[PDB]
Chains A and B, each alone.
With several copies, the nearest count.
Chain A
Amino acid sequence: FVNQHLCGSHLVEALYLVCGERGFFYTPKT
């Protein structure tokens, strides 16, 4: 259960990296 709140921290690093300047909506509350 902690993996989500922890790995999600790295998912965003790749998200705004792929998006570059574009933004992204991150919603972990699946």
Chain B
Amino acid sequence: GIVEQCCTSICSLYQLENYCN
């Protein structure tokens, strides 16, 4: 979901925003 997605090839700043609150 978020870990497997960012702990595989590093998520981009715009990708991390989707998880922001």
Residues of A with Cβ closer than 8 Å to B? Answer: 1-5, 7-8, 11, 14-15, 18-20, 22-30
Instruction: Give the bracket for the number of chain B residues in contact with chain A.
Output: 10 to 19
Contact yes or no, B21 A1, CB < 8 A:
no
Contact yes or no, A30 B4, CB < 8 A:
yes
Contact yes or no, B9 A1, CB < 8 A:
yes
14 sample A-B contacts, Cβ–Cβ < 8 Å, listed by A number: A2-B7, A4-B4, A4-B7, A5-B10, A8-B3, A11-B2, A11-B3, A11-B7, A11-B11, A19-B20, A22-B21, A24-B20, A27-B1, A27-B21
Shortest CB distance A29–B (Å): 8
- The prevalent SS among residues of B at the interface is helix
